Amino acid sequence: FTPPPASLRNPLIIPEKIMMGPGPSNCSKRVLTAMTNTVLSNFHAELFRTMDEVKDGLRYIFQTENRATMCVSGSAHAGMEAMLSNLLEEGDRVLIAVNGIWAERAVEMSERYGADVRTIEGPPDRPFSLETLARAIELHQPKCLFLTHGDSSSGLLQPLEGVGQICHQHDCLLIVDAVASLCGVPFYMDKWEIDAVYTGAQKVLGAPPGITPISISPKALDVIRNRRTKSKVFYWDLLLLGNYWGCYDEPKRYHHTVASNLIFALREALAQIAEEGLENQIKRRIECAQILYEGLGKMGLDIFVKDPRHRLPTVTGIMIPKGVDWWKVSQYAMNNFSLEVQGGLGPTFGKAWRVGIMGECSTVQKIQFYLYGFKESLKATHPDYIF
Amino acid sequence: FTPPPASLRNPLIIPEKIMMGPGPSNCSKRVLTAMTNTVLSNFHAELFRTMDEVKDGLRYIFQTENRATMCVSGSAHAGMEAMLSNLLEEGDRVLIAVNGIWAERAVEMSERYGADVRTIEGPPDRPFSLETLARAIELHQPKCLFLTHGDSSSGLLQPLEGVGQICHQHDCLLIVDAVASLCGVPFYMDKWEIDAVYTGAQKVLGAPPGITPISISPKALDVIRNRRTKSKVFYWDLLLLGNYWGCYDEPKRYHHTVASNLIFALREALAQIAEEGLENQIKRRIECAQILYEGLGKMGLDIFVKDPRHRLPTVTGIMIPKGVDWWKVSQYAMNNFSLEVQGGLGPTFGKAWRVGIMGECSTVQKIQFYLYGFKESLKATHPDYIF
Numbered sequence A, B: 001f002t003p004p005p006a007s008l009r010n011p012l013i014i015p016e017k018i019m020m021g022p023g024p025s026n027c028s029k030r031v032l033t034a035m036t037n038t039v040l041s042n043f044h045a046e047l048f049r050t051m052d053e054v055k056d057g058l059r060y061i062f063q064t065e066n067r068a069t070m071c072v073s074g075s076a077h078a079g080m081e082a083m084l085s086n087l088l089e090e091g092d093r094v095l096i097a098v099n100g101i102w103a104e105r106a107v108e109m110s111e112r113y114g115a116d117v118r119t120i121e122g123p124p125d126r127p128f129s130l131e132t133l134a135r136a137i138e139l140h141q142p143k144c145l146f147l148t149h150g151d152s153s154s155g156l157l158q159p160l161e162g163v164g165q166i167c168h169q170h171d172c173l174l175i176v177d178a179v180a181s182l183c184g185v186p187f188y189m190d191k192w193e194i195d196a197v198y199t200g201a202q203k204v205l206g207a208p209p210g211i212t213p214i215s216i217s218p219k220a221l222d223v224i225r226n227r228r229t230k231s232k233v234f235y236w237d238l239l240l241l242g243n244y245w246g247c248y249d250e251p252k253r254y255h256h257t258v259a260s261n262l263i264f265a266l267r268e269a270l271a272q273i274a275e276e277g278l279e280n281q282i283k284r285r286i287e288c289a290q291i292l293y294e295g296l297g298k299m300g301l302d303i304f305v306k307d308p309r310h311r312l313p314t315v316t317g318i319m320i321p322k323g324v325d326w327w328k329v330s331q332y333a334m335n336n337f338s339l340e341v342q343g344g345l346g347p348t349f350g351k352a353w354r355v356g357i358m359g360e361c362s363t364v365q366k367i368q369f370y371l372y373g374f375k376e377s378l379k380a381t382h383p384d385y386i387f
C-alpha cells in the first residue's frame, strides 16, 4: 500500500463568508444542520415522508399541481440535461432563444442528444419579445421551446406570460429554466401554461447544491411516455425517477440512491419559504434590489441591464468602470469583509461584477453591508476613482 | 399565491438508525458535521484546496497515480453513466459480464447510449473465471469490458488479477465497478491494469450519498480525447469535468456547481481512512465478516454465496428460512433495536436479507449487536423457528 497523503492530516477549515454573488447563497443554520441527520435507506418510511413534503413544497414554489414534480440528483445543469434527454429524440427540432450563457449550454446539450437545434439570437440585455418568439415558432415548428427565465449571467428577467399559449397552438412544449428567478419574482407554472421547469437549490432558496427540483406537465409527461426510443440517460429518465418519487400510480422501485442529506436540507429550505410565504419573500427581494439600485446610482455606477423594467431582482451586473481592475476589488472585499463580490460570466465576462440577493442575504441590512464593503473595496483599491 | 402546504409546518425529525444494510452506511459524526460548513463558490481557493485533498485521498484508496482522478456529481449510477458515455460511441462493442443487478444496469445504460452490447451470463453466486472472460473477449473484440467487482446484490466478490492484462492484449479497456468493495478488500487499480473505476460515498467509506469518486487511466483518457463525436452528456463529460478538477494541464473553467458540502464530507471520510490506513481497515472488515459467518452458522442460517472463497466481506446474503416472512423480521428489528435489516435485490430479491459491514458499523461490537437483534427479531417474530 503506497503511503497516505499528508494533505489529509490537517483538520478541515472552512471560513464563514458573506455569499452575495449570484450563487451559491448562504443557507440558514437550520438548513445546514438538517444535513447532519442520519443518511437513510432508499425505502425508509421517513425518507418517503420527507420526499413528499418536498414535492408539496415544490408545488408551492413552482405554483403547479403537476403530479410529476420531483428532484434530479445533480446540480441545475442536470435539470437541464434531464429536460432535454427526456423530451427530445434524435432529429427532433428544438428552438432555443440564445442571449445568455445558459441557453448556450442548452444548445450544447441538445446537440449532443442529437436534436436538430434551431436558435434565435438576442441582445444579452434585452428580452425576447412575444412576437419575436411567436415568429420563430411558426418558422421552425419545434417540439420544444427553451427559455431562460432569470439569467444570472446578465441580470435579465425574461417575461413569460402568453409564451406557453403560443407554443401550445403550434404543438410545442415550453421548457423554462427558473434557476435564478424562483422565489425572487412571481412565477406561475400552470397559469403561464409552462410544461417543464427546473430551479436550483443554491440560488434563491438558500439550500445546498447537488439536487435540482423539477416539474413537468401532464402534456410533457405524455410526450415522454410516447417516445419511440428509450431516452439516452437512465439516471434521469423521468419515468423511472418519477416512479421512485411516487409521482405515478405505480409501486416505487429502486432507481438510484438519493442524497438524503441534501433532501433534508431542501425540505427545510422549502419550510422556511413556506412559513414566511412566497409573496413576502418576493417583496423582500424587490425592496432589497431597490436599495441596491439607489446605492449603486449614488456611487456613479452602471448596471448591465440599463432598463429597470427588464431587471431580474436577484442578480445585478455592476459595470467595471473605465480605470478599474475588477479582481483587485473582489480580493479586497473577501480579505477585509469576507464579502463575496463575484466576477462576470458569459455576456458579463470581464465587463461587470455580479451581485446576488439570495438565501440568507436577502435582507436590508445585508444589502447595506454589501454597498458599504463594496465601496470601501473600490476606494481602498482604486484611490483615484470619483463618486 | 395558492396556499403553503401544511406538511411543512412540523419540524423535521430523523431518528438515529443502525445502518447495517449494504448501504447507505452510518457516517461518523465528524463526516456528518463537515457538511455544515459554508457552501463555497466554484472558484474559492478553499474549495480547490479541498478538492485536491480529495484527489489525493482517491489515489490512496484506488491505489493509482492517475491524474484523471475526480468525482462525478451524482450517485454511483452516475459514475456508471459517466464511464459508459465517455468511453463509448454509437456502434462500439461493449462486453458486459452479467450476473448481478449492476451489470444489468450497465446493459441498460449502454443500450441507451447506442452501443452494441455483448453479454455473457453467469450464476449469481459464482464469479466469472479468467478463461471464461478471455474467451468472451476474443469472441467479441470489445472496446470495453465491464465488471462488477463486489456485488451488493449477492455478496459475490469477483477476482480481477490478470483481467486487465488480457483486455490490453486485445485492445480493450477494463471498466470496474468498485462501489461495494473498495476499503473492504484489497484493490490495486494500477497493478491490476484497470482503466476506469468508480466507487460510492455511502457504501464502505461512510460518506453521505450524491457524489461519486472515479478514476481513469492515461489509456482511457486518450480514448476519450480521440472520439469522433462529442459524448452524449455534457454534465459528466470527463474532459470538461476533469478540467475543473484540475486533472489536466489546462486552466480550470466553470463546468457545473459541485456539491461543496458533499465534498467536505468525502474529504473527512477519506481523512478517516487515511489515519487508520487501508490495510487495517480491510483487516477489520475481514474479521467482522468472520464473526458474522460464525454467528450465522450458529443460528443454522445459510449464506447466498455458499463458497466462502467467493464472498465479499462487506455484503452478505442471509437466506430466508423456509417458514419465514423476511419483512416481519425487519420491522421488528427497526422497531425494537433501530436495526436496519435490509431485504434482497436482483438475484437475492425475496430469497435473502442483506447485511453490510460498512462505514461506522465495521466494528466487532456492531456485528455482535446485529447478530443479537437479528436473532431476537427472528425469535420474537417466528416463535417456531429452530436454532
Ligand SMILES: *Cc1c(COP(=O)(O)O)cnc(C)c1O
Pocket (backbone or CB within 6 Å): A255, A256, A257, B022, B023, B075, B076, B077, B078, B102, B148, B150, B151, B152, B153, B177, B178, B179, B180, B200, B203, B209
Ligand atoms: C450499492 C451499489 C450501487 C448503487 O448506486 P447508487 O446510485 O449509489 O444507488 C451501484 N453499484 C454497486 C456495485 C453497488 O454496490
Ligand SMILES: *Cc1c(COP(=O)(O)O)cnc(C)c1O
Pocket (backbone or CB within 6 Å): A022, A023, A075, A076, A077, A078, A102, A148, A150, A151, A152, A177, A178, A179, A180, A200, A203, A209, B255, B256, B257, B258
Ligand atoms: C446559476 C444558474 C445555473 C447553474 O447551474 P449549476 O449546475 O447549479 O451550477 C444554471 N441555470 C441558471 C439560469 C442559473 O442561474
Ligand SMILES: Nc1ccccc1C(=O)CCC(=O)O
Pocket (backbone or CB within 6 Å): A040, A041, A042, A043, A254, A257, B022, B023, B024, B152, B153, B345
Ligand atoms: N437503500 C436501498 C433501498 C432499496 C434498494 C436499494 C438500496 C441500495 O442502497 C442499493 C444497494 C443495495 O441495496 O445493494
Ligand SMILES: Nc1ccccc1C(=O)CCC(=O)O
Pocket (backbone or CB within 6 Å): A021, A022, A023, A024, A152, A153, A345, B040, B041, B042, B043, B254, B257
Ligand atoms: N460560483 C460560481 C463561480 C464561477 C462560475 C459560476 C458560479 C456559480 O455559482 C453558478 C453560475 C453563476 O451564477 O455564476
